[PDB]
Amino acid sequence: SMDALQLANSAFAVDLFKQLCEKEPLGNVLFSPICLSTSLSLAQVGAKGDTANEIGQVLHFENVKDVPFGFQTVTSDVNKLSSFYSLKLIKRLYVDKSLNLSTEFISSTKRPYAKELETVDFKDKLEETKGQINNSIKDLTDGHFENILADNSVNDQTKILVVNAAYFVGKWMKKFPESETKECPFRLNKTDTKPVQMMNMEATFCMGNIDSINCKIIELPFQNKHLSMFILLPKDVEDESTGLEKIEKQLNSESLSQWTNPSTMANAKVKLSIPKFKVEKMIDPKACLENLGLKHIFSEDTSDFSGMSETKGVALSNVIHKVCLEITEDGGDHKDELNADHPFIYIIRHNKTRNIIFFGKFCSP
């Protein structure tokens, strides 16, 4: 089934995660790979030749058939889910009015990327535009993203702007009892330590542990199993350089899929300890994307956007990606242990389609 777009989406997610890892080796990386894949695939429809092909290869759409309908499906699922959860995955692609878009592009786009594209006047009324875009995203995002543009230098030469705003205030299927949360040392590495609010329970979870990778993997479902967190916890505490080397050599698309597949896992009564955490991160994916092989998209000289416009000098001028994840005790009502008191990679996925929606690493409180 050619919702093998999932595999494409997670390959690209790993790729870009590795890049972000390289750029913040000690930072809490968090980003929403699905928003970026969605936005770039929309850009792709407007591209031709090498520009279009580059997007295809980087996003791994090689052997996916109807890409647009695939995203049409994932977006709808997610937008629905946004009526149960405190979840927003807002993706906008802003084009300047001075690039009269083709009808064929607009009709090709209405349904698969509904509301995700809109035309704006960056050129002349830039400050009004910027004010409008900020407020629109502030509202679209229920007040969390105050001023999304405000350190990204969006200028009046902006031709195409991609903004991704995403957030999630997790509600677990199995709540952590508030009274059992207590302050504990988080091991940053073999020697160093920093305080965390460790949440604690004992309940039944699909869990696995790979001997070779020396990793413990747990699935922590959110309310009604629409989304699941997968935590990848090394069994032993390690220096950053070591754990960073493992991310370079161990982790890859195929591997992430395999260690994270709940059929690899068994049902276990786990003594669970998870840090209570709130992470907010903004990235400029441009540099990282170029490292994966995306050049033409950003240059106004070499880019081809005949599919969407015939104004010369059109390029992806700017990409803003801000993500905020809040995790608390809040939830509904053989043995193993899982104590996440040291750095772990985590993914949050959409269980129905299996797409990764949030991808991160918790490195320190």
Give the integer Cα–Cα distance in Å for 100 and 79. 29
Give the integer Cα–Cα distance in Å for 328 and 281. 18
190 with 63, same domain?
Answer: no
Pairing of β 266-275 and β 335-339: parallel
Tokens for 325? 């994840």
358 with 316, same domain?
Answer: no
Tokens for 129? 């535009």
CB burial of 281-320 (b: ≥16 within 10 Å; e: otherwise) equals bbbebbebbeebebebbbeeeebbbebbbeeeebbbbbbb
Q: What is the resolution in angstroms? A: 2.8
CB atoms within 10 A of CB 51: 26
Give the integer Cα–Cα distance in Å for 110 and 216. 43
Task: Residue 94: give its domain's CATH number.
Answer: 3.30.497.10
Residue entry with tokens 């960073």? 244
Give the integer Cα–Cα distance in Å for 142 and 89. 11
Nearest alpha-carbon partner for 87 in 224, 181, 201, 230: 224
Query: Residue 245: which residues within 8 A CB-CB, separation 6 or more?
Result: none
Task: Residue 207: give its domain's CATH number.
Answer: 2.30.39.10
316 with 248, same domain?
Answer: no
Provide the domain limits for residue 357.
Answer: 171-276+329-365
State the DSSP string of 279-339: EEEEE-THHHHHHHT--TTT-TTT---TTTB--TT--EEEEEEEEEEEE-S-B---EEEEE
166 with 104, same domain?
Answer: yes
52 with 103, same domain?
Answer: yes
Give the integer Cα–Cα distance in Å for 66 and 266. 35
Residue entry with tokens 């104590």? 339
Output Rg (C-alpha) for the chain, integer angstroms.
21
Torsion of Cα atoms, 269 then 270 then 276 then 279, to 10°: -100
Which amino acid type is present at position 274?
I
147 with 266, same domain?
Answer: no
Query: Residue 248: which residues within 8 A CB-CB, separation 6 or more?
Result: 18
Backbone phi, psi, residue 193, to 5°: -150, 150
Tokens for 22? 């390289």
H-assigned helices in 82-156: 103-107, 126-140
Asked if 89 contacts 137 with a C-beta cutoff of 8 angstroms, the reply is no
Give the integer Cα–Cα distance in Å for 303 and 47. 8
Asked if 29 contacts 21 with a C-beta cutoff of 8 angstroms, the reply is yes
In sequence order, what are the beta bridge partners of 309?
101
CB burial of 55-64 (b: ≥16 within 10 Å; e: otherwise) equals bbebbbbeeb
Give the integer Cα–Cα distance in Å for 203 and 176. 10
Give the integer Cα–Cα distance in Å for 17 and 6. 16
H-assigned helices in the chain: 5-23, 33-46, 49-58, 67-81, 103-107, 126-140, 240-249, 253-259, 286-292
Asked if 15 contacts 336 with a C-beta cutoff of 8 angstroms, the reply is no
207 with 180, same domain?
Answer: yes
- What is the domain count for the chain? 2
120 with 187, same domain?
Answer: no
321 with 196, same domain?
Answer: no
182 with 199, same domain?
Answer: yes
97 with 181, same domain?
Answer: no
Query: Residue 163: which residues within 8 A CB-CB, separation 6 or more?
Result: 90, 91, 92, 94, 133, 137, 148, 149, 319, 320, 321
114 with 228, same domain?
Answer: no
